[PDB]
Design a protein around this ligand. Structure first.
Ligand SMILES: COc1ccc(-c2ccc(S(=O)(=O)NC(=O)Nc3ncc(Br)s3)s2)cc1
Ligand SMILES: COc1ccc(-c2ccc(S(=O)(=O)NC(=O)Nc3ncc(Br)s3)s2)cc1
Ligand SMILES: COc1ccc(-c2ccc(S(=O)(=O)NC(=O)Nc3ncc(Br)s3)s2)cc1
Ligand SMILES: COc1ccc(-c2ccc(S(=O)(=O)NC(=O)Nc3ncc(Br)s3)s2)cc1
Ligand SMILES: O=P(O)(O)OC[C@H]1O[C@@](CO)(OP(=O)(O)O)[C@@H](O)[C@@H]1O
Ligand SMILES: O=P(O)(O)OC[C@H]1O[C@@](CO)(OP(=O)(O)O)[C@@H](O)[C@@H]1O
Ligand SMILES: O=P(O)(O)OC[C@H]1O[C@@](CO)(OP(=O)(O)O)[C@@H](O)[C@@H]1O
Ligand SMILES: O=P(O)(O)OC[C@H]1O[C@@](CO)(OP(=O)(O)O)[C@@H](O)[C@@H]1O
Lengths: 328, 322, 328, 328
């Protein structure tokens, strides 16, 4: 059949639904920021920083330059879309209220550059976003960003890995897109991706083992020493949530950042890290839990609230929930 | 100061050493293969595979291998190639024969290709020392005889680490220029890091020394905080992190891989060379990796490398358990 | 103010006009084809043709491969847009009727790779297009493409020169966009371009001088030997219509391909060469004539009809038309 | 055969000639400047000038920014090569003497961005250079650049057209290289190009016709009104010397910028425009004359000296020279 780019694919869906165009305009702007971020992440123009024309400007805090630039690309592209009223960024203490003359109907929570500890060693990094409609009748404020994940209008992520990929869901499953750098556009590469029912990879930072609860300690023990005669799982932990979650999506398995003694509410952020990937994984037939309730059912209380995160193949998450139940 | 590209930087060193030019020509060809691999890894031209011009035809391991073999053979600098991808050694035709042997993994971290995690290219270069006809025995030199070694990391950006025996230099591909820019000269690994890197899914197959060492990283005996864990699943990605952040990377023997998994010629020796050139250690647990005398081109060996105090602590666990 | 990409700019206009989305979707597909042509024109992937991976495949005819590739890119992207019913291409003898299941309401006339004699010497080349609404109630046929240029819905061109530019008009002047290759998208760089009233450059192939009519001969002589102490015009003739016309738009002056004894009907094509650039030049405040009437007023009679073309700064075209009347 | 990049192709020649490597290092540095120029010419990063991250920085004079940037790229890359002692640039009034600690043995005359009047309309532009060995025993001075073109060690040009090409000669014919933007390297596409004995294209600015001498007037008249039953020549004048000269090389024909009443010594510059392309055209078996002697034999007297230029296919230049003798 036909070769489809992301914005054409979105336009076709927004037209058949006879929508206003505002979501399409918002998403198109986000992808323009994503292309710009990807180009900077891949180090376009670096020779000019190192004095090819005689002006040396070597960068000191490259995680700071890149997350500051990323944040500006996303904020500027979204505000200029005329589609937004409230933005929440991993990089900003307070919610960002769109100027009245550019105001639209959507709230966007995003991490402009996820996996910052991987910037200097060049491992995979990413951008994560979740989109809500403003539902309150009042003035736009940070309370409009405090909806639970079941109300997501669209969510997705960009992975700046060995290639640049976008996963996107509007409520009808997960579609994958690859950036063709020679074309400059995202090509639709996989429709309605479905996670494996059960995987063979478990993904978590085991340096927190002395702080784990008993259920987490038990679950990891089962992965290494199956009570079963089956082979133990392989372990993977890239250290970028977007990279590890995407691997979980396309290979199956489980990803965990549980609460521990030093992080009793988890580390990952509910609004702009856990909810979007929980939405993506569940749309693909997976599960996402805090260990006591579904992530998407949590009512947020603060825009930078933390939550434990366990997600992936449904059977793997189910075994983890059983470990939680068995340990009180 | 001046902006230096990789090939200019190598040319100046090869000139001041008054060498024949053959190493420079080999390296320039390898870098051309790496640029081509990087472009393919980033999926340039993917829209034509998906029918933008009307021909739908929806591989990377094979292409990388052909890119490296063709660029190396066409350099006129090679006599024997050993690739992760070929059962036998590849002898260069006489009209293209030069004096160097190259061992390479054209695309390391192959289980990470489909999930778009970091992958890489690894290589080690030797001079042919035998007087006979070129054969695979020319590739069986131990890592002490490396002329040059390095790797390409196709991660969030494309980087090359390179050593010719005088430390490790790092270069970044500026995709708008099309050339690798020198970004750091003579990198030194930290004495001690705070990250440990290995596949803990083999925990039931570990020997006691590995088991004890992993336990010490999680439950330190000295009130200090436990190490963080990272395991990308690509040796090149994990080793390069070890180089620039410090810490330790391990693929020890286990019950199912009693001589290890990683390959001595084109995986362990090149990264062992790099890590030692940066002031770190690389051991099999009983001797330095670079001292292992190869016996077959696809020989496996255990690999533990990184910051020297961390490797020293692992060796203490090895000895404490015999 | 805001940084706008072509598709963002078009969506905004299509929203405020409350359209169905079909033109925006058509244009979006055309721009994807143009980006793909631009990448091939700049020779992306040439190293693989010359055997970098061991497969040598040097093209014996560069001009044949590129216009065949260009033609396929445009046809495939337009048909796949679901916006077209009839295509007229410089490369196809008959009109191309879209398959029934992909039919939309628009007719597109295009030259996919104009300036073919400049391909092997690497001078500027381009893509030209004009868009019409289907007017018949019947089955689509080539009669839907035989409308005169006054009925153009949208027209423009891509110039693959020292950089890649698109000029576009939907009836409210001419806008210029530049392709940022590091971003992969066209950026709006100039709104509502206006041609100079009078220029100082004349552009025509004087190797046909022995075939010119008397008026053309007189006009050219006036440009070299002015009778009013003013300096003679400079001459430029790139040999690619898109390049020479675009210089005319942004620098002023006149471009001519008049009838001559060997081309008594002119050389350039009415549907997908003369009408589109006539539309652009008039939208910018210039004139476009065949020497007896405005180009946009000619009623097409066959899809590959030729017509004389004189266009550019209004005062220059008028001096030429004065020469035409003066010589009967 | 094998896929050869420019720097590999040069290294192999420099090895078999067992030279010091200094010329190779110089050329490699020059190609880096050319790659950087091509990227800027194609407008990489333009979206950041137009505020994609919120920082608008639209440039007023585009021809001023690009030729200043070009000039800086060439000067810095060449000086940093440690291969140069004297540089002459179209953009600098005085010769540029390399600092003592970076001094090498070569003198470089270059036009970093030829065809500047074509920058804003996106027609083809280029870079021209000629390399000489310092032969004086004295201190480096501009006199080291005043050698005549017979003493050229290497010369060539970059054409930033529909694709980027480099023409290069070290004295054994002309080789052509194309920049593959996906690889970032120049691929050898044609070895030892030879110009046609006689062409069918003539190329000059006929807007100076009232200022031509009699021989030029007669030669142009013969091209349009042949007295021997042959067809008249076609005319082309891009307006960028590199583009017009390169077309002359690969298609045949003639390019002329003769002296005229307003430019009694010609317009084009001997050191960094006429000598380099004269070298290229002669290496390919063509001719390059001032109308009274071969261009390569003129002994320069000032670094910015002008000279008339007539070059191309030998039979075409000879017909021009016959007109010069015929008019005294
Ligand atoms: C049932 O699955 C789906 C999937 C996707 C969607 C949607 C995507 C975008 C929207 S939208 O609200 O922004 N509307 C529009 O974009 N309209 C337009 N008019 C003209 C043009 Br051109 S685009 S709805 C709806 C349902
Ligand atoms: C002491 O640290 C080092 C580091 C690197 C090297 C080397 C790199 C390449 C070589 S080489 O053998 O290929 N010779 C050359 O390339 N010669 C040349 N002539 C002209 C040109 Br232009 S390059 S030696 C030597 C010593
Ligand atoms: C007065 O000057 C102008 C200039 C341009 C236009 C037009 C451009 C495209 C069209 S259209 O017909 O395709 N419809 C739409 O694009 N609808 C949409 N809805 C939502 C989204 Br998001 S796009 S109309 C109209 C008038
Ligand atoms: C017979 O026609 C020709 C054509 C070209 C040339 C030349 C090109 C460059 C030079 S050079 O002087 O710079 N020396 C070198 O490059 N030496 C090197 N050694 C090792 C490496 Br690796 S490069 S000579 C000579 C003769
Ligand atoms: O180092 P630990 O504690 O494992 O945290 C890793 C997690 O933190 C994040 C949060 O963004 O990365 P980082 O702190 O490196 O920015 C996630 O990408 C990653 O999953
Ligand atoms: O899956 P496990 O056994 O951890 O092996 C991972 C190791 O194997 C290698 C060997 O190439 O990758 P892979 O099998 O994924 O291609 C190394 O890059 C990586 O470090
Ligand atoms: O060679 P002449 O007759 O001047 O033709 C020039 C005209 O023909 C065209 C027709 O497309 O070029 P070409 O045949 O070289 O592709 C126009 O771009 C150009 O304006
Ligand atoms: O406008 P005219 O006088 O024809 O000058 C054209 C010549 O001048 C040059 C000199 O660099 O261009 P320009 O003045 O446009 O920079 C040559 O490229 C071109 O051949």
């Amino acid at each position: 059949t036909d070769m489809l780019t992301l914005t054409r694919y979105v336009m076709e869906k927004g037209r058949q639904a006879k929508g206003t165009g505002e979501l399409t305009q918002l998403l198109n702007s986000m992808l323009t920021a994503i292309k710009a971020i990807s180009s900077a992440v891949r180090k376009a123009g670096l020779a000019h920083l190192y004095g090819i024309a005689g002006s040396v400007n070597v960068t000191g805090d490259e995680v700071k330059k890149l997350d500051v630039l990323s944040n500006s690309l996303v904020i500027n592209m979204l505000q200029s879309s005329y589609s937004t009223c409230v933005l929440v960024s991993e990089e900003n203490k307070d919610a960002i209220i769109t100027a009245k003359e550019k105001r639209g109907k959507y709230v966007v929570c995003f991490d402009p550059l996820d996996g910052s500890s991987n910037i200097d060693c060049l491992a995979s990094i990413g951008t994560i976003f979740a989109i809500y409609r403003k539902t309150s009748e009042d003035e736009p404020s940070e309370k409009d960003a405090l909806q639970c994940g079941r109300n997501i209008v669209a969510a997705g992520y960009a992975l700046y890995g060995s290639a640049t990929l976008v996963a996107l869901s509007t409520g009808q499953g997960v579609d994958l897109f690859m950036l063709d750098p020679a074309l400059g556009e995202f090509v639709l590469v996989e429709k309605d991706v479905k996670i494996k029912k059960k995987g063979k990879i478990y993904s978590l930072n085991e340096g927190y083992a002395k702080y784990f609860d008993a259920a987490t300690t038990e679950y990891v023990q089962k992965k290494k020493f199956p009570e079963d005669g089956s082979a133990p799982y392989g372990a993977r932990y890239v250290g970028s949530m977007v990279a590890d979650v995407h691997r979980t999506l396309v290979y199956g398995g489980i990803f965990l950042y549980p609460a521990n003694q030093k992080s009793p509410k988890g580390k990952l952020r509910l609004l702009y890290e856990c909810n979007p990937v929980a939405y993506i994984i569940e749309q693909a037939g997976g599960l996402a839990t805090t260990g006591t309730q579904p992530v998407l059912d949590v009512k947020p209380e603060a825009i930078h609230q933390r939550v434990p995160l366990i997600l992936g193949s449904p059977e793997d998450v189910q075994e983890y929930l059983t470990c939680v139940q068995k340990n009180q």
